[PDB]
Swiss-Prot record, chain A:
Protein name per Swiss-Prot or TrEMBL: Serine/threonine-protein kinase MEC1
Primary role: Serine/threonine protein kinase which activates checkpoint signaling upon genotoxic stresses such as ionizing radiation (IR), ultraviolet light (UV), or DNA replication stalling, thereby acting as a DNA damage sensor. Recognizes the substrate consensus sequence [ST]-Q. Recruited in complex with protein LCD1 by the single-strand-binding protein complex RPA to DNA lesions in order to initiate the DNA repair by homologous recombination, after the MRX-complex and TEL1 are displaced. Phosphorylates LCD1 and RPA2, a subunit of RPA, involved in DNA replication, repair and recombination.
Record annotation: effect of changing residue 531 to S: In MEC1-100; impairs both the G1/S and intra-S damage checkpoints but not the G2/M damage checkpoint
Subcellular location: Nucleus
Lineage: Eukaryota, Fungi, Dikarya, Ascomycota, Saccharomycotina
Alphabetical UniProt keywords: ATP-binding, Chromatin regulator, DNA damage, DNA repair, Kinase, Meiosis, Nucleotide-binding, Nucleus, Serine/threonine-protein kinase, Transferase
Curated annotation (Swiss-Prot), chain B:
PTM summary: Phosphorylated by MEC1 in a cell cycle dependent manner and in response to DNA damage.
Subunit and interaction comment: Forms a complex with MEC1.
Gene of this entry: LCD1
Keyword Nucleotide-binding among UniProt keywords: no
GO MF assignments: damaged DNA binding
Protein species of origin: Saccharomyces cerevisiae (strain ATCC 204508 / S288c)
Protein name as annotated: DNA damage checkpoint protein LCD1
Length: 1069, 421
């Protein structure tokens, strides 16, 4: 139970003490430990191997030294671990074989080989040799560490003590392997204090570091410092800075170890590794250790039981790169700590307090000048005791809030990538907007852009993380409706080409900032971070200077690369700058397996076909002449970006004289082959894979088009007297002629709208109907499709000649055309037409009037695919309705058997929230509000680049209404509530003034007191609708609501009843 | 009707198999609806109780006529429905888990109480009991988190019966049946409803954690059912097959020792209604271990007595460190213990003498002489000691059975010397 109480570090130390009372040479102690550990394990809801593989590496380190005698101890161990010898042998070879090699020369590796061959005796030698090949790195580390020598004679001797098959002197000379220096920096078994033995082992493992292949043929023993040079250090760390990238890719190998038999001992070992390297490693090594490192130890940090060690290494990184830089990766940590501080124990809490106080004592400039949302968050979650950690910094954080109109930085750190960071982002979004609402301050008389960033998070979670979707959704709800008006809902960037020096250099700044940090700062496979390294040696050679001798201003001997890296945005320069001291080149290229086969294009889609396709087109179109080329080993992450991003080389077909225009036509028709793959009557396998191929090829076309358009605009800006200018006009017109040609309009549009999209079809079809007959006679097939795609996108015979006026400023006539043609209640298409129409101008209680449920029968029971009428109606009730209305429909909408629908399920959730505060339990009404918010924020919005929010009207109106239904923070208190009548008068500020749904002067107040309706507050429900109808031609709805209120005799409400009657048109009534 | 609502439950695959935590793609954005949640769940549990009652008509039916209501169709329908309910991969609900395991229980009861037993034990497939008991060991290793039993908890390792799906059931009342009140709003009750009145998953469920306590007293009695029907399996085979292959020592003793460890580490001192029921029933699962290890000692082989030598030996050792009991051996202050934990059963002695026995008022002086020690060893069995000499020598003879070297003879002394011997 002491172990049960103890956390991470101390827990594992005590668990090792427990495995000691387990092999304590007695059956009694043995078996008492066995029971208590197994009980502990499957009442910790873990497995004994999952709790002991944390300490089992240490245990086998102590055991391998005497395995031959301790077969009984090992077998007792394995029976308790439930797993066999092997599955832990291989998953922890990294730290069992190394200690096994260097024990007495009569080693047990022959016996371990006999373990690998118990049912055979194939060759002890060959098991040994393939094993040592699999673990050829910490074995060297140990051979110069657990006995400390680097002279080649006894060095090789110990390599071949019982392992002669490591022959030919040394097999391929990777003593400075990325993996070697990883698995040795892993051995950095540090602690809090500096023991003599621990310090000397660290110093002698770094001696093993400073012995590498350079002297592995021309050799003291490297067990001290008297054998290191003060001059070879910078080139030494150059080589070790090559080393580190593969070192922590081996870190991710041990941490993101897909095996599953892995556990977190390897993760704290990686903590040790990163610690050691950044410690004895200077500035260049510790800056080239930024990119994937935060991911390696953040994977460590997410794991509960290496959080402590995770913050240990995090704090020593804090010590190891000061305030002016690394302000990139305080977001992850302030997020993790403000996000799990409701968990953090004493030791986690005071080490994070130490993080913070070191942050204050060194990098106040980092925190409060570079990432101000960090200060605002670290005082907007104050129970952490941040004042109790510094206190007098409260004046500084006050300065940070007040001095800055900090909406854009809030958006940008909100624009951050993953759940924890955006999680704190939106939490402090809540506290901020509460402060602004309560102190009438949210500038609204950007916010809009942080709004858009929030919703883009939501849509990146469109099928993901329901919970932050609901947080995100209540945050859009607490920011409000928003209809441009007071602000501007904003969203092909800068003059680019593949021709000239500086503009290609800026194209490459775009390249780095839009391949590395998005998809390579986030990549998890060591092979592809090595490819990351490759592509960015290509990058740092195209910016080939400051990679040999050029510094910041050590000499200032030339402004060229200084102005390069000073034009370069600081995120770019910091994310890729450090590698400049790496000189790596690629290999002799692989095979071809030629192109232009639509058969493999159908049965392959995008997994490998289009990628080898891009391989060939690059290797024949750029051929090292451009930083395009050696990305040749994208060995499927940044797929739909880079397939176009290397599809601009067209210009060299001015006078081709090459097969390049030949393969340009061939690649265009390969795309048309992807077209010809047209669903073939298959399932998801099509509707996903070659669908994203479809967006791939859209981006390629949009990309060539944008290249052409900028090629036009930038070149002519000076003057317009060079229109031909040496065959360039011929090339540009020839390429656009090919574009005017290639357009299988039918299949194009069909699949364009098969994907959840609108502009791909829009623009392709725009051009290919520029090539149309003057009369619209090619239109018959493709006029039935934009009227089905718009019904989602939002850019919205006798029956065909009735809707002439339908929405033309004068609804009533065509509107009751519909309510008539649907009194027949037999044609569903026109029925939805009806409801949606007499819905748009919000005749919602006639919608609930035209209800098929409070009738001879209930509504269309267990509503099958014909539930969209409910979808249209429940909101009708849900804001124009009451205990009786909402309930009689709420017990008539559930209806189905599965939960398939989304819109009427939204309106269902808030209908049942209303019946919930008919029962009047406010908190679990907030629970139904959670359900509604989750639903809309997950299943109701998509990304930007499509739809300005004018056509997300229903969605954002519903969002604003949901917050007003149930949210308790700024208006949570009762004192707050009375003065919130005055503060509800300020709901229009945040929402807007549009009669659609943004007008919320007292219209939303007519809902605050409706949600808060109890006795005296129920009498105030209709009294709060004083200036509600102030907004109200389409006032039948205002009519019903105002009747409801007149049922209270409110003179202002009676006044606005007169208002609606007059607004119809009348003067003197 | 058996097979009937079985195929109906295969009709309602959706709710019985809803993702353990609604993995990202799948969302719990349900219309907060015990409306149809009641429909499905109610049908399932009610019909599982009907399966129990059908087993009962045959269960008390003459065992000259037991070759009829057993068929492969019974078995297979129950295969599909049992597997849909005990959803090891998705988030089940505890009414259905109760009900399915109860059906398993009565099934086994009749597997014994059928006279010509070999034929129908051939009929029921060995792999089919095995697919029962994989999921039933899964159950016993699923646990009980009262503080959050009415909240979406961990991956099925936290039997919850969430308020979102919460009524009693028919031969048993485990929940609060709060949603029975919303059955008091199940239909309009003033209208010919076509679709019915909501029941709501959100509205249903600091008030009376006695709710959680009685429901847990159930889950406790559930695991009494589970242990006793594991035990009944133990009897269905004297010479056995794949269902008990030493696994009914592994998992059984794993539960036995998990409950020793939990009763000690928390539950005594946690001193709640559960204590005595749990301790009686886990000492009984000790007895199950005993008879397995004595008569069914034939099966247990080295590989599995080595997989769980641990549990076996030390659970026996824990019960063993008690017999001499130099503490009280009487009613002096082991009755203090009867007050610190058995206070619940003290309320029960009070209630049975003042409310709940026609004769246990005005005690006749030959019964309280017995009470002072009997209720005292009851609370001793609560507090890890003074288990009936029956119990204590059961536990001793499970271990000191030197006929098999479960203990190393040279260290059984170091074992026992914690007590003596």
């Amino acid at each position: 139970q002491l172990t049960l109480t103890t956390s991470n570090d101390v827990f594992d130390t005590l668990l090792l003490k427990l495995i000691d009372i387990f092999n304590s040479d007695d059956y009694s102690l043995r078996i008492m430990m066995t029971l208590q550990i197994k009980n502990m394990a499957k009442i910790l809801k873990k497995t004994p191997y999952q709790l002991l593989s944390p300490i089992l590496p240490v245990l086998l380190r102590q055991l391998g030294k005497n395995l031959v005698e301790r077969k009984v101890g090992f077998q007792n161990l394995i029976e308790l671990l439930g797993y066999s010898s092997k599955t832990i042998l291989d998953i922890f070879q990294r730290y069992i074989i190394p200690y096994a090699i260097i024990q007495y020369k009569s080693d047990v590796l022959s016996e371990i080989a006999k373990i690998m061959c118990d049912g055979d005796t194939s060759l002890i030698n060959q098991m040994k040799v393939n094993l040592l090949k699999k673990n050829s790195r910490q074995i060297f580390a140990v051979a110069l560490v657990k006995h400390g020598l680097f002279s080649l004679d006894i060095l090789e001797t110990l390599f071949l003590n019982r392992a002669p098959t490591f022959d030919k002197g040394y097999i391929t000379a990777y003593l400075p392997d990325y993996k070697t220096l990883a698995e040795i920096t892993k051995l950095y078994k540090n602690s809090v204090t500096k023991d003599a033995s621990d310090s000397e082992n660290a110093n002698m493992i770094l001696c093993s570091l400073r012995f590498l292949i350079t002297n592995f043929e021309k050799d003291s023993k490297y067990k001290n410092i008297n054998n290191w040079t003060d001059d070879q250090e910078q080139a030494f760390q150059k080589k070790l800075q090559d080393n580190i990238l593969g070192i922590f890719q081996v870190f991710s190998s041990d941490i993101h170890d897909v095996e599953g038999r892995t556990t977190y001992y390897e993760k704290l070992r990686v903590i040790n590794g990163i610690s050691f390297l950044i410690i004895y490693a200077p500035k260049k090594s510790i800056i080239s250790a930024l990119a994937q490192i935060s991911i390696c130890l953040q994977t460590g940090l997410g794991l509960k039981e290496v959080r402590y060690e995770a913050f240990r290494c995090w704090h020593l990184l804090v010590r190891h790169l000061n305030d002016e830089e690394l302000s990139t990766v305080i977001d992850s940590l302030i997020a993790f700590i403000l996000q799990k501080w409701s968990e953090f124990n004493g030791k986690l809490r005071n080490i994070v307090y130490s993080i913070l106080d070191t942050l204050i004592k060194e990098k106040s400039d980092l925190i409060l000048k570079l990432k101000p949302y960090t200060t605002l968050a670290l005082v907007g979650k104050p129970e952490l005791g941040i004042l109790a950690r510094d206190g007098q910094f409260a004046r500084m954080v006050n300065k940070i809030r007040s001095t800055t109109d900090l909406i854009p930085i809030f958006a940008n750190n909100l624009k951050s990538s993953n759940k924890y960071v955006i999680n704190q982002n939106l939490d402090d979004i809540e506290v901020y907007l509460r402060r602004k609402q309560t102190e009438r301050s949210i500038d609204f008389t950007d916010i809009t852009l942080v709004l858009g960033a929030l919703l883009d998070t939501s849509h990146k979670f469109r099928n993901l993380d329901k919970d932050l979707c609901e947080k995100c959704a209540k945050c859009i709800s607490m920011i409000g409706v928003l209809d441009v008006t007071k602000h501007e809902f904003k969203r092909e960037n800068e003059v680019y080409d593949l021709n000239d020096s500086v503009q290609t250099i800026k194209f490459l700044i775009w390249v780095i900032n839009d391949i590395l940090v998005p998809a390579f700062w986030q990549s998890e496979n060591p092979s592809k971070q090595l490819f990351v390294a490759l592509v960015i040696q290509e990058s740092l050679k195209y910016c080939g200077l400051s990679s040999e001798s050029w510094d910041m201003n050590h000499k200032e001997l030339y402004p060229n690369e200084a102005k390069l890296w000073e034009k370069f945005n600081s995120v770019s320069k910091t994310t890729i700058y450090p590698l400049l001291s790496s000189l790596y080149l690629a290999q002799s290229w692989k095979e071809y397996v030629p192109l232009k086969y639509p058969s493999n294009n159908f049965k392959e889609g995008y997994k490998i076909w289009v990628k080898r396709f891009t391989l060939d087109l690059l290797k024949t179109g750029t051929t090292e002449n451009h930083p395009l080329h050696v990305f040749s080993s994208l060995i499927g992450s940044l797929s739909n970006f880079l397939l176009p991003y290397i599809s601009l080389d067209i210009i060299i077909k001015a006078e081709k004289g090459t097969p390049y225009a030949d393969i340009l036509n061939g690649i265009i028709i390969e795309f048309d082959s992807i077209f010809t793959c047209n669903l073939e009557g298959m399932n998801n396998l099509q509707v996903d894979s070659l669908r994203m191929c479809y967006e791939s090829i859209f981006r390629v076309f949009e990309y060539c088009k944008k290249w052409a358009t900028e090629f036009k605009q930038n070149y002519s800006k000076l003057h317009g007297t060079f229109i031909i200018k040496d065959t360039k006009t011929t090339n540009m017109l020839l390429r656009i002629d090919e574009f005017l040609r290639t357009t299988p309009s039918d299949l194009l549009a069909q699949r364009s709208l098969e994907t959840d999209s609108f502009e791909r079809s829009a623009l392709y079809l725009e051009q290919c109907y520029r090539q149309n007959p003057h009369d619209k006679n090619q239109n018959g097939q493709l006029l039935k499709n934009l009227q089905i795609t718009y019904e989602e996108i939002g850019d919205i015979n006798l029956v065909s000649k009735i809707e002439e006026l339908q929405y033309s400023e004068n609804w009533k006539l065509a509107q009751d055309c519909f309510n008539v043609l649907g009194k027949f209640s037999d044609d569903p298409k026109t029925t939805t037409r009806m409801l949606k129409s007499m819905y748009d101008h919000q005749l919602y209680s006639q919608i609930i009037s035209n209800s098929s449920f409070h009738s001879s029968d209930g509504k269309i029971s267990l509503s099958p695919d014909v539930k969209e009428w409910y979808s249209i109606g429940l909101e009708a009730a849900n804001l124009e309705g009451n205990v009786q209305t909402l309930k009689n429909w709420v017990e008539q909408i559930e209806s189905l058997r599965n939960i398939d629908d989304r819109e009427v399920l939204l309106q269902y959730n808030i209908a049942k929230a209303l019946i919930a505060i008919s029962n009047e339990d406010p908190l679990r009404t907030q629970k139904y509000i959670h359900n509604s918010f989750r639903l809309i924020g997950t299943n109701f919005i998509t990304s930007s680049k499509e739809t300005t929010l004018l056509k997300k009207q229903n969605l954002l109106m519903k969002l604003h209404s949901l917050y007003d239904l149930s949210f308790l923070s700024s208006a949570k208190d009762k004192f707050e509530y009375k003065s919130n009548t005055t503060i509800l008068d300020y709901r229009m500020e945040r929402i807007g003034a549009d009669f659609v749904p943004n007008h919320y002067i007292l219209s939303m107040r007519k809902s605050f007191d409706q949600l808060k309706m109890n006795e005296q507050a129920d009498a105030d429900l209709g009294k709060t609708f004083f200036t509600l109808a102030q907004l109200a031609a389409r006032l039948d709805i205002a009519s019903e609501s105002l009747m409801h209120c007149l049922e209270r005799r409110l003179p202002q409400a009676e006044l606005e009843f007169a208002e609606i009657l007059w607004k119809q048109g009348e003067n003197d009534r | 009707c058996f097979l009937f609502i079985c195929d109906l439950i295969r009709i309602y695959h959706h709710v019985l198999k809803v993702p353990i935590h609604e993995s990202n793609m799948n969302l719990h954005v349900e219309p907060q609806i015990f409306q149809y949640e009641l429909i499905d769940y109610l049908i399932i549990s009610y019909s599982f109780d009907l399966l129990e009652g059908i087993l009962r008509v045959l269960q008390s039916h003459p065992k000259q006529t037991y070759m009829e209501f057993f068929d492969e169709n019974i078995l297979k329908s129950f295969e599909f429905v049992y597997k849909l309910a005990l959803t090891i991969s998705y988030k089940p609900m505890v009414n259905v888990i109760f009900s399915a395991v109860e059906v398993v229980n009565i099934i086994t009861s009749i597997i014994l109480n059928m006279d010509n037993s070999s034929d129908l034990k051939s009929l029921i497939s060995g792999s089919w009991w095995r697919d029962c008991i994989t999921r039933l060991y899964a159950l016993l290793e699923k646990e009980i988190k009262s503080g959050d039993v009415y909240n979406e908890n961990v991956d099925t390792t936290t039997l919850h019966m969430s308020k979102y799906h919460d009524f009693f059931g028919l031969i048993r009342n485990i929940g609060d049946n709060e949603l029975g009140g919303l059955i008091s709003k199940l239909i309009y009750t003033d209208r010919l409803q076509s679709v019915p009145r909501v029941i709501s998953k959100e509205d249903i469920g600091f008030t009376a954690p006695i709710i959680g306590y009685k429901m847990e007293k159930w889950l406790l009695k559930l695991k009494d059912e589970v242990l006793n029907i594991f035990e009944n399996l133990l009897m269905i085979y004297g010479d056995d097959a794949t269902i008990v292959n030493g696994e009914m020592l592994i998992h059984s003793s794993k539960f036995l020792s998990r409950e020793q460890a939990l009763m000690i580490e928390r539950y005594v001192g946690q001193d709640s209604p559960n204590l005595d029921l749990r301790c009686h029933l886990i000492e009984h699962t000790l007895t199950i271990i005993y008879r397995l290890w004595k008569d069914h000692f034939k099966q247990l082989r080295e590989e599995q007595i080595k997989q769980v030598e641990s549990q076996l030996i030390m659970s026996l050792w824990r019960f063993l460190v008690c017999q001499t009991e130099t503490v009280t051996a009487n009613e002096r202050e082991m009755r203090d213990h009867r007050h610190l934990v058995d206070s619940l059963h003290d309320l029960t002695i009070k209630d049975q003498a003042s409310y709940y026995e026609d004769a246990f008022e005005d005690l006749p002086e030959y019964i309280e002489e017995e009470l002072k020690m009997q209720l005292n060893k009851r609370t001793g069995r609560i507090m890890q000691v003074k288990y009936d000499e029956k119990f204590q020598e059961m536990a001793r003879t499970i271990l000191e059975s030197k006929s098999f070297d479960l203990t190393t003879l040279e260290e059984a002394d170091s074992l026992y010397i914690s007590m003596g011997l």
